[PDB]
Every structure is written in C-alpha cells, then in structure tokens.
Design a protein around this ligand. Structure first.
Ligand SMILES: *[C@@H]1O[C@H](CO)[C@@H](O[C@@H]2O[C@H](CO)[C@@H](O[C@@H]3O[C@H](CO)[C@@H](O)[C@H](O)[C@@H]3O)[C@H](O)[C@H]2NC(C)=O)[C@H](O)[C@H]1NC(C)=O
Ligand SMILES: *[C@@H]1O[C@H](CO)[C@@H](O[C@@H]2O[C@H](CO)[C@@H](O[C@@H]3O[C@H](CO)[C@@H](O)[C@H](O)[C@@H]3O)[C@H](O)[C@H]2NC(C)=O)[C@H](O)[C@H]1NC(C)=O
Ligand SMILES: *[C@@H]1O[C@H](CO)[C@@H](O[C@@H]2O[C@H](CO)[C@@H](O[C@@H]3O[C@H](CO)[C@@H](O)[C@H](O)[C@@H]3O)[C@H](O)[C@H]2NC(C)=O)[C@H](O)[C@H]1NC(C)=O
Ligand SMILES: *[C@@H]1O[C@H](CO)[C@@H](O)[C@H](O)[C@H]1NC(C)=O
Ligand SMILES: *[C@@H]1O[C@H](CO)[C@@H](O)[C@H](O)[C@H]1NC(C)=O
Ligand SMILES: *[C@@H]1O[C@H](CO)[C@@H](O)[C@H](O)[C@H]1NC(C)=O
Ligand SMILES: *[C@@H]1O[C@H](CO)[C@@H](O)[C@H](O)[C@H]1NC(C)=O
Ligand SMILES: *[C@@H]1O[C@H](CO)[C@@H](O)[C@H](O)[C@H]1NC(C)=O
Ligand SMILES: *[C@@H]1O[C@H](CO)[C@@H](O)[C@H](O)[C@H]1NC(C)=O
Lengths: 168, 315, 315, 168, 315, 168
C-alpha cells in the first residue's frame, strides 16, 4: 500500500488476531496480550461493505431478443447485430476488468490507511512517554500494567500521569 | 511495551490490481456469475409455452396452435419443435412480426366481417388435419365455385374501429403448376393489391414445382400489416388469395425467449437464455452473451475477484 | 497555544462516493442537465422550417413544397404536419432518402432534358391544386394522346454531366382499376426498366381499389437512385410512368431535426430534440436519449452530484 | 478520508472560517484569533477547478437522426436501433455514475491530504518547541504573542529564537 | 547532516491528470498508435489477392476469376480493380454474400448434376472472352434450340448430399428488348420459381434498354441461397434462366480485407485497413476507425501520454 | 502529490542523481556524497512496470468488415453502422482519456508515497539522535563519519550507539 504500514514498516500480520482486523499486542511484567481495536476495524469493514453495496446493484434495464437462435435472421443484419453485440462485450469486459483492478488497489490502500491512522492515534496518546522502534511498536518508558495497557487501547491513557517517570 | 498490528490468514485469495497481478488479500469475492439454473424460472409470471405452436402460427391458426389463438402472457417461450404452418409456406418479414408478438402480451382476436358471394370459401387440405381435411382457423381459402371458373375481381374492405392497431394477415397461394392454379381460381394472371394509408403493395402468384413439404409442392405466402385506428385496409384480388377472417389486437406487454428447458414455477428470474435462467446479484455474467431480460452485463472473463479484505502478509 | 482546522457549513450537500452513499460535502455541483429550452435555437444558422412541406416533397414538388424546390440550409426542421405528396403515394426506401436530404445542405435542381413526341405530357389532378388542377412541379405525368391509345414503348436517357451524384426520382402510377389504367396508357401489361451502372430494377403497375385518400383510390409509387458523375440512367417504359423533369444535386452539408417547437434566432444551440434545444456545459443529460447534434451523453439518472469541496463536518 | 485528519483526529470544521478552506486558530495572553492559510486553500481549490475544467469539456462529435418520430422506420431495423441506443445508454449511465463516485472519493481524499500537509508543515516549523495534543493543536511551550503567532502562520517563526525557553 | 531527495531531469514530458493539465513528469510513454505499415503484412497466412477477380466472381466464374474458382485462404484481399462480372449484371443481396465469402476460408466446388434435353446449353458472348466467345465457367446459359422456339417449362432439382450448406447461384437474364428475349427463349411471360425448405421466391425477366456496359444493354441478375444438408432446391423455369453448373461449399474460416497496398510476407500482422497493417502493442490507435482483425481500439485523440516516472521538479 | 513530499516539503529533485529514483545526500567532516536507495526505487519501478504490463495486453477479439469501402452498402443500414461505430468511438475515446488521466494521477501519487516511506524509514532509524529541518533533511546531533552515513543508508545504524552523545 501507499501508506507503508501493512506489508511496510509493520512486518506481517497476526494469524492469532481472530476478533478484529487491527489490534494491540502488549508486553509488560504481567505478560503479553493481544486485543482488537473495534473502531478502526469497523471503519475498514464499513468502507468495504459500501463498495459491495455499490456492486450488487440491480440493472433495471430490460433488453429483448433482436436475433433468432432457431431460424437465423438475414445474414447482413445478423452481421451488424453480432458486431454491435461483440463491440459492447468488448466495452463491458474492459470496464469490469478496470473496475475490479481499481477497486482492489483502493481497498488495499484503504486498509493500509486505517492501520496508519490507528498507529498515529496511539502515538499521539503516548506523547513524550514512548518512542517508536520502527516496527509498529512503542517502547514505553514507564511501568505500564494491564490497566495501563487497557487505558491506551480504549483512549483513557493520561500521558501527564506518567510524564514525570517516563522522561526520567 | 505496546505493539500495533493487523490480521492475516494461512490461505488468502489472489486478486489483481492496477500495479500488480496476483496480490494475496485476506478475503475476496466473485463478481462474474457462472452458475446457471437449467430451467425457465417463471414463478409469478403468466407464461405461455408454445411447444409445437410457432409464434406466428398464433395469428393464422394451424392445428398445433388452436389452443393459442387468443393467448395472454407476460412471458412467451418459443420451442425448437414449433411450426408456424400446416400448409407449407412462410411469412414475409417474419422476424419483424415475431419481435412484435414477443412483446405484445398476447393477442385478442376479432372478426373482420368479410362476406362472400359467387365463390367457395371452404378450401381445405389434408395437411391441416382436424379429424379430417381443414385449413388455418383464422383464414379462409377462397376458390372458384367450380373447376376453372373465373375468380371474379373482388374488393373487400375493413375499417379498424378499435383504439389500437390491427394486425392483418393474408396469404398468397402458389399452386404446384400453372395448370393447378387455373382449376382453383380460373385462368390468367391473378393480382392482389393491398393498400391502406401508410402501406401500398401488389402481389401476383407464382405457380411452379417446389420440393414437396407435407406432401405439397405448393406454398402459401403470408403477408401482414398493422392497421391504425380509424384507418381502412382494402383488398382487391382476383384469385390465389388466402383471406383473413379475424384481425389481431395486442393485449399489452411481455417478453419472449427461446429455450430448450422446462418451466419451473418455483424459482423466480428475470434473465433468461436458451439454457435456463441467470439468477444473480453479481454485476457481470460469463454464461451467455445473448441473454435477455434484466441481466448482469456479459463479459468475456470467467472470473474477476474483488478484494474484500486487506493485503494478506502471513508469517 | 496554536490550532489547525478546516471550514464547515450548517447545510452541506450530500453526494455519493465509492465507499459511502450520502456523504455530506461543503459544496457540490450537478453534472446531469435537466433544463430544456422549448425552442429550436437557430441563431447563426441558415434554417429551413419545412412546415407543411414534407422533406421528400422538396424533390418531387407537391404544391405545399413550391417554396422549397431549391432550398439551402444548415439546419432542416421537419414538422408533424408535413406531407410529401399531393396525389396519394409513397416513396420506396423513404427513410434512406430522408437521411440523405437531412444532411445535404439543400438541393440545386437542373433540367434533365427529356423531350417527348406522340404522347401527352400534361397529366394533372384536382389533388395537386394550383389555382386549378396541376401536378408535381418536378415531374411529368405521361399519357396516351387520346383514351385507350397505346402508349408507345419509349426510351429516355440522361447523362450526369456534373461532378456530384444526381438524385433521380420517377413514379409508377397505379390506377384505381385495370379499366382506368387502359384509358390512361392503353391496354396490356406495362413495364418500366431502370438501369444505370450500379443499379438495375424493373417495375410493373398494379391497378386496384385502395382506400380513398385525397379523393383517389389510385396511388403513385415514387422511386429514386443516385446517378454518379459521367454515368447514364436509361428509362424504358410503355406507360404508368411519372417521368422526372429535373434532377437534384446536393449543395453541401446540414443537419435535420424533427421538432414541434418554434424557431428562436436569439438563442444558440447545437443539440436538438423534438421539444427544443439542450444548451449545457454539462457532460450528461437526462432529457432525451434521441437528441441529435453535438450533445451531452444521455444518462438514465436525473442527478449525479460532483463534490467541489471537502467533507462537511459541522459542530 | 484516507489521511485521518478531516473528520479524523481533527474533530470538526469551523463555521466561522469564512475566508479560506483551512486555517489557524490561536490562543495566547492577547486572546484568541482565527486566520486562513491561503496556500493550502488555493492548492485544494486549484485541484478541484482542474477537475471541473475536465468535466465541462465539449463533445465535438455530431450525431444525426437514424430513426423517425413521425413515421416509424421498419420494425426490425427499429428494434436493432433501439437496442443499440439502449446498450449505449447502459454504458454511459454506468460511466457517469462511476466517474462521479470515483471523483468524489478523490476530492474528499485530496482535501483530507491538504489538511495533513498543513498540519505537518506547522509541526516541522515548531521543532522541539511544541507538542501535539492529538486534536490538531500544538501546545506551545513558550510565550507566543500575536507577532509570534503571525510568524508561525506566514513561515517566519524561528524555532532557535525560542528553543532555550521552550525545552526548559 | 543527512538529506533525502528524488531525481529530476532538465527536459521532462508533460502529461495530463485528473486535477491538472500539462504536468511535467520525468518520463512518459505513448498509448495511441499512429505509425502505419503501408503493406498487408501476411507472413504465415494463406493469402489470396483477388486482384482483378471480384469476390462474388469466384462463385460464378467470369474469366478474370478462373484462377480463383476453388481458392483456399486464411486472408482474402479485395482490390479496387476487381470485377464480379463479365456479362453485365449484379447480385441480389450482394454484400450479405461478400461477408459470407470473406470468412469462408475459400470455396470447394462440386457439380450439381443437371442434364438437359430439348434446349441449347452453350450460350456465349464476346464479353466473356476466353480465346473467343465464352460464358461464366460455373454457369450454363440455357437457350431454345433455334430462334423463337418455345422454351419448355422445365424442372431441375438438386439435393445437398453433403454435410455443410451448399451455395447455389442462378441468374435471370434481361435481354435488351422484348424482341431479343423471344429469339432467345420464345415468346410470352417467362417465370422461374425457386423453392427449398426455408426459402421461396419467384422471378420474371424484365427486357428493356439499359445503358451499354461492355457493349451490352442487357444484364443478368444473379441470385443465391444456402441449401442445408439433406435439403433439396427445385428450379421451375421456362426461359431467361442462367442455370448453376456447380455448387460451392465453404472450406473453413478466414478474414477478408479491402486494401490498396502490396502484400509483404516478411511482416506479421493481425490488424488491417485499406492503407496497410497496424502492428502495435499499444491499446489504442488513431489510424483508421474501420480497421479489422485483432486491433487496438480506435480513439479520436492523436496522443495520450501515460506517465512512467515521478513528477519532475527541476532546479 | 497527495503525500506532500515530492514537489512538497522536499524542494526539488537532484539532476545529479543518475543511479536511482530516490536517495541520500550527506554532509559531514569528510565532505558531501549522494547515493541512491535501491529498495524504494525498485518498488516504484515495479509498480509502474505492472501498470505498463496491464496496458500492453492484447485484445484477442476479432472484428470483421460490416461495410464496404469500394461499393457503399445501402444508405440506411450504412447510416446505422456509422452511428454505431461513431458511438463506440465516443465510448473508447472517453475511456482512453479517463484511463490515462487516472493512471497518471495515481503514478504521480505513488511516487510521492515512496519518497515519504523512505523519509519516515530514516526518521525511525535515527530516533532521538536527529531532528527534521523541514526540507527533507535530518540534522544529526552527533559525529557521523562516512561509515556512519553508510550504516544509515543500508539500515545498520544503531541509534543507541550514539544516543548518549546526540541527546547531549
Ligand atoms: C452471430 O453470432 C452467433 C453466435 O453468437 C452465430 O450463431 C452461431 O452460429 C454458430 C455457427 O456459425 C453455431 O455454432 C454451432 O454450435 C452448435 C452447438 O450448439 C453446433 O452445431 C456446432 O458446434 C456449431 O459450431 C452456434 O450454435 C450459433 N449460435 C447462436 C446462438 O445462434 C451467428 O451465425 C452469427 N450471425 C451471423 C449472421 O452469422
Ligand atoms: C424504439 O423506442 C422508441 C422510444 O424511444 C419507440 O417509439 C416510442 O413508441 C412509444 C410506443 O411504443 C410511444 O409512446 C407513446 O407516447 C405518446 C406520448 O408522447 C402517447 O401516444 C403514449 O403515451 C404512448 O405511450 C412514443 O411516443 C415513441 N417515441 C418515439 C420517440 O418514437 C419505438 O417504437 C421503438 N422502436 C420500435 C421499432 O419499436
Ligand atoms: C459512413 O462513414 C464513412 C466514413 O467513415 C463514409 O464513407 C466515406 O464517405 C466520404 C464521403 O461522404 C468519403 O470522403 C471522400 O474521401 C476521398 C479521399 O479518400 C475523396 O473522394 C474526398 O475527400 C471525399 O471526401 C470517404 O472516402 C468514405 N470513406 C469510406 C471508408 O467509405 C460513408 O458514406 C458513411 N456511410 C453512409 C451510409 O453514408
Ligand atoms: C468473504 O467475502 C464474502 C463476500 O464479501 C463474504 O460473504 C464472506 O462471508 C467473507 N468471509 C469472511 C471470513 O470474511
Ligand atoms: C376515430 O373516429 C371517431 C369518430 O367516429 C372519433 O370520435 C375518435 O376520436 C377517432 N379517434 C382517433 C384516434 O382519431
Ligand atoms: C459551489 O459549486 C459551484 C460549482 O463548482 C459554483 O458555481 C459555486 O459558486 C460554488 N459555491 C461556493 C460557495 O463555493
Ligand atoms: C468525366 O468525363 C470528362 C470527359 O468529358 C473528363 O474530362 C472528366 O475528368 C471525367 N470525370 C470523372 C470523374 O471521370
Ligand atoms: C521511458 O519510458 C519508456 C516506456 O516506459 C521506456 O521504453 C524508456 O526506456 C524510458 N526511458 C527512461 C530513461 O526511463
Ligand atoms: C442425412 O440423411 C442420411 C440418410 O441418408 C442420414 O444418415 C444423416 O444422418 C442425415 N443427416 C442430417 C444432418 O440430417
């Protein structure tokens, strides 16, 4: 993707992350844990679903028979019809190919984007109390227990509360 | 320490993008429909399966079409075994007439009121059998009263007093030889002129040997026109003329298909082809480029996978 | 402290995107034109409003077309009250001929130089009235000198000595009966052959009763061909032949429309339909799928709003 | 948008910002003020106008009548024409829908992008003299009077000049 | 200190984007092909250059087509100097027949087995010269044995015993006058009926003066039908009939082009127009909207530059 | 571009950078040097080449003649054919124009994106040992010899090794 997170500075995904698309994996004195972030996940899901809703839209235009499978129509008008139909097929095969390729690029890029929004969100929560290691992780320069981790995940982490220790 | 990440799976799905072919994503879905239902899904639709009746036969009425002389339908199904004729012959501008009848919703017949004197009106043949020799149910085969008698020049007119156009059909009979034609209608060149207000055309019969079809080397040419409301059609003829007995009026709207599969009133569909019904929410199909109805757009690709998840980067 | 931000409004405009339906943006603009001007905007264009003259009539010249026998135009307007004929009849391949004349830029007439001896040349009827009985201004109704006299087999040839193709029109007259045809042209079957270098066709008249139109149960079939430079057309006929007096040459280029609205030389347009003119900078229109000229592409949607501002996030 | 500023970590827009698309809202001892940034605004405006100039381009192709509204052409050729015209309409309705949807996504995303470019521009001007609060604001760790604010807005802010105080 | 940067060049290439016209990028490439090869690149393809033989002539066999009576080809080239005829005349539904023959892969001829008694079968003219007066190699000009003798009403039938449809061609001869026609075939109206199983049509000759082409004011009308396997065609005629001697069967598949340029067996191509061959990997072409084969899509633009490098920002 | 690097906070390109698309230009006591980054360059190159491979794909659909250049077909069917062909040309000219414009926007934006990924990569390597000056440069707060520069370029720079000096 365009945002160089997924398949970028974040090395690979987590096959154990079964409850969401994106998440946090923590380590402290109490051990390691992994939890999913709902908001980022649902944002990506909502956007892909909107794409799907566009694509499963019903064509409400009726077309009728203009040639005959049992009794072939006159040759010349039949050659005109076949050429017209083959030209339209050319156009719709091109459109389908282009549509899916373009939409897949954008889907991949949008998922990349939601990962970065989550990473920067956490970064901005942590302020001067952490440093990025370059792999999607924040080195925390203070004791961060399970409740401390939980407050980072649900946006109740007070950087001031730990500011004094962490800079130190 | 705290780390951000994203999900992955052991087996993803490969898709194509603008910059790369075969990129693996966590999940994807098909956009091109390939699954066909090998029936005409007709639940909820007044359906007429013409079977052995050819669509054009519903206007003239060979025996195989007696049950279809005034049909009503939303969906009309032509079958490969259908025949428009009993006495051999063929329509002029036949496909134009089929396309009119496929979208008509059916036909409503009404007598046009032609009466005759000085001729026979009961021409029949063993090719149109109804418990014996008969003819087209909607036509009258006009003859001289006796062999070689002169067919009088005659004029028959019909005014469309209704509010929608009238489908008028007549026939030109070409006997197997000049000799057979004189016994039926008297000697000399015979002429039928057809005129209305937006139509004018003449027909002269052409006797001659033709390959024997249904035992006959003669043929009937069926012609038609649409007669506008308050307009009049006038027939001037002196023989070899298959006269119309009733006119046809179109009931409403319908669609016609050509199929070789059974009708299923338990599936619902709106996109038909000769092999069945395409029922799909997908925007594209790779089944039949000649499908008709409300259809996904036909495309040449068998598969176009749309990504529904992020790029899959496994460990 | 210093803060970055973006603008918003109380009432934004909802638009559609790839991922969401009904996203509110600060401003948007319409891409589909729905506003019609109920006139033929013809400012700056040589315009011919045919009115009661039918376009094909400009070649043969019934009275309603006398003012249009050599018209010149960039824009040709056909009207619903137009009639191509006075003596009832109709053209063969009429629509092909209309499409040629709509883009011709007008016609320039020139005498073809046919002279006759041994026949009448002044056939007239009260259906083509010019202060009495008359005929098509560009044609000559050829008759026997006296009733039932034989119409001599005759040959008339015309060489196109000019540099563009010549439009040649002739007519076949079908009298109301075989008896009336013999008084006009003498008895027997009558034949007209038309040949050039890329065309060959024969015509035999078909007398008979037709519904009375303009008091007549007879009709004239008008036929035409385009004669190439240095090529010759030869007419061989023995009666029932409406001879051409002048040939037509196309002036240049034009466009033809069919309208039911007045001409306005004070608006300028290039996209016309029967209800008026589409004047728009928009790339799409939802007004008439049969509009002609230089037009926005017809689309089925009435509205497609294009975002011209950021997402609107109000407080 | 893809850049998680507008309708993202920046909470909402300013209905009082009537002189530009993006801007600065400051607070110091002299009070609060709001001013628009011209460069970012005009960049977004120039890009949307370029899109408009593409869309109001004249089709220079002439099409003429091929059927007849007063005297219907023969049925079969008329059915071929109607089918062809309806197929083309299918194609152009699809193209119009796709074009506007795609262009609207990109317009929204481009406006999101210009907001982030402005935010990061200011961030890079301020160096170690400020901290981001996560809502689009920079906490300034030095006295910043109205002239000091004006220098941030027009890119004449010297971080060194305040470096000593701010870190302190 | 360490700095990040990107490359640039002194002269970039301007391209267009969605938001800007004339953006300079480091490198770009053309997507619209304008370069034409002024030859028919035919390397690897069985090619038939018809030259002076008209495509329809390969079925009837005027002298210029003697070398092409049973051709085999993947690529068929028609030339502007080609003529289908020797004795003047023209085919009915000629373009339908050309399109069938362009994709046939060539034709395989077979005698249909008609034998005659009581007539002449060796009609010849100095317009079809083969070291003297001759005729179409695949036809037989049927005549009365002696001048003005009656042409007997006759019936000839042919059954297609092969597995693909048979192309059957016959001709109707229109002499220069009614008087000349009676010397060839005897007096009276003459009639030819053609019937099979899906075809029925009558023809009556039309004698008359036509402009002299190849010294003759007479013409031959060539007609055709495709006869299905196991089906029979029956000809009933009494004169003015150009009988078929052999039927044609289509060999396989091919493509036909119309060109004015030489053949080059040293270049390979799949997209042809009258001026040569379009050989290109590009998806679009601005050369000829009527190109045929496997072609880039024709577009109205002469150039559409696709960026292949970053934006160029020079110093 | 959307990422405000190329033609953005990075002022212009380097005409002397002839061995890659993106690179590093260093200055230390040993002088100045410029080298290209291969990974970012090849990523951009691979993506543009993939676009090219899509566009030079062969249409495998054959179309045959339906009119006649030497003997014009009948006028009416000829007018139907010309109109159909002109309508298809309208559609393909539109598609070609839109395709190239869209692809050029994305190519420019993707190249902009790779520049930012490289800049942030270096930023994350350098940690607290450098400060961004706002022009694409990192002010290094420690002695960084040619080997030190080389380690930044090829990702072997140990921020800890210089951490003590640089903060100081
Ligand atoms: C316009 O295109 C249609 C095809 O979409 C052509 O009709 C098709 O004609 C081919 C022969 O040219 C038929 O192929 C045959 O298929 C059956 C198997 O079902 C079998 O007999 C052979 O395998 C043979 O190849 C095909 O059935 C037929 N399909 C339809 C739907 O009509 C048609 O000829 C073209 N129009 C003109 C005027 O040429
Ligand atoms: C091809 O499509 C056109 C429509 O685009 C068909 O012509 C249209 O025919 C319908 C009837 O089938 C006409 O509808 C009528 O509208 C008027 C009101 O103006 C009124 O009499 C009724 O409401 C009736 O529904 C319609 O006027 C007419 N429009 C045009 C522009 O011709 C045409 O029949 C189709 N072609 C073939 C060969 O069927
Ligand atoms: C459908 O369109 C074709 C064009 O794509 C029309 O055929 C073209 O007809 C024009 C005249 O209307 C010809 O123009 C002539 O060009 C030659 C130079 O080569 C010269 O004589 C003059 O400059 C003249 O303008 C053009 O050659 C011809 N092209 C082809 C490929 O046929 C055609 O008339 C249209 N169809 C109908 C039914 O009108
Ligand atoms: C994968 O995608 C399809 C279509 O979006 C969906 O029906 C299916 O449930 C999805 N499966 C998972 C595991 O996401
Ligand atoms: C047909 O004629 C009757 C008069 O008997 C008239 O009332 C009716 O309106 C006419 N309809 C049309 C369509 O002309
Ligand atoms: C909103 O958009 C339209 C079209 O771009 C423009 O004419 C109009 O002036 C705009 N209004 C404002 C307030 O931006
Ligand atoms: C027509 O014939 C004249 C000879 O009188 C000749 O000069 C002229 O070039 C010819 N034009 C064409 C188009 O053949
Ligand atoms: C520029 O682009 C074309 C097509 O991608 C390529 O063939 C050519 O080698 C390129 N040149 C350079 C210097 O990149
Ligand atoms: C044609 O007839 C023969 C009988 O002589 C038969 O064996 C063959 O299968 C038939 N073919 C078709 C296509 O009907």
């Amino acid at each position: 993707g365009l945002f160089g997170a997924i398949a970028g500075f974040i090395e690979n995904g987590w096959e154990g992350l079964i409850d969401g698309w994106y998440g946090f994996r923590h380590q402290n004195a109490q051990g390691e844990g992994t939890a999913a972030d709902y908001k980022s996940t649902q944002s990506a899901i909502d956007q892909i679903t909107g794409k799907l809703n566009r694509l499963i839209e019903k064509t409400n235009q009726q077309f009728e028979l203009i040639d005959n499978e049992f009794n072939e129509v006159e040759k010349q008008i039949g050659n005109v019809i076949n050429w017209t139909r083959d030209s339209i097929t050319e156009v719709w095969s091109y459109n389908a190919e282009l549509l899916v390729a373009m939409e897949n690029q954008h889907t991949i890029d949008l998922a990349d984007s939601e990962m970065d929004k989550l990473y920067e969100r956490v970064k901005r929560q942590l302020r001067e109390n952490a440093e990025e290691d370059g792999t999607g992780c924040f080195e925390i320069f203070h004791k961060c227990d399970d409740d401390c981790m939980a407050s980072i995940r649900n946006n109740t982490y007070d950087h001031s509360k730990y500011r004094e220790e962490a800079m130190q | 320490k705290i780390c951000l990440g994203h999900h992955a799976v052991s087996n993803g799905t490969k898709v194509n993008t603008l910059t790369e072919r075969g990129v693996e994503v966590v999940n994807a879905t098909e956009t091109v429909e390939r699954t066909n239902i090998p029936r005409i899904c007709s639940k909820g639709k007044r359906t007429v399966d013409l079977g052995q009746c050819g669509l054009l036969g519903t206007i003239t009425g060979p025996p195989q079409c007696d049950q279809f002389l005034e049909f009503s339908a939303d969906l009309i199904i032509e079958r490969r075994e259908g025949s428009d004729v009993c006495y051999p012959g063929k329509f002029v501008n036949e496909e134009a007439l089929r396309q009119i009848l496929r979208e008509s919703g059916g036909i409503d017949k009404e007598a046009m009121g032609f009466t005759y004197s000085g001729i026979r009106t009961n021409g029949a043949t063993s090719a149109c059998r109804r418990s014996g020799s008969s003819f087209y149910a909607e036509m009258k085969w006009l003859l001289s009263n006796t062999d070689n008698a002169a067919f009088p020049q005659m004029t028959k007119s019909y005014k469309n007093t209704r509010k929608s156009p009238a489908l008028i059909v007549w026939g030109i009979h070409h006997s197997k030889s000049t000799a057979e034609q004189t016994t039926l209608y008297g000697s000399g060149n015979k002429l039928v002129t057809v005129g209305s207000s937006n139509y004018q055309q003449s027909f002269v019969p052409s006797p001659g040997a033709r390959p024997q079809v249904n035992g006959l080397s003669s043929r009937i040419d069926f012609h038609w026109l649409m007669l506008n409301p308050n307009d009049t059609v006038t027939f001037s003829f002196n023989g070899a003329f298959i006269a119309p007995d009733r006119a046809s009026f179109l009931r409403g709207k319908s669609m016609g298909i050509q199929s070789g599969v059974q009708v299923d009133a338990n599936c619902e569909g709106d996109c038909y082809h000769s092999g069945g019904t395409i029922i799909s929410n997908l925007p594209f199909q790779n089944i039949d480029s000649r499908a008709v109805g409300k259809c996904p757009r036909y495309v040449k690709q068998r598969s176009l996978l749309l990504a529904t998840g992020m790029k899959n980067v496994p460990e």
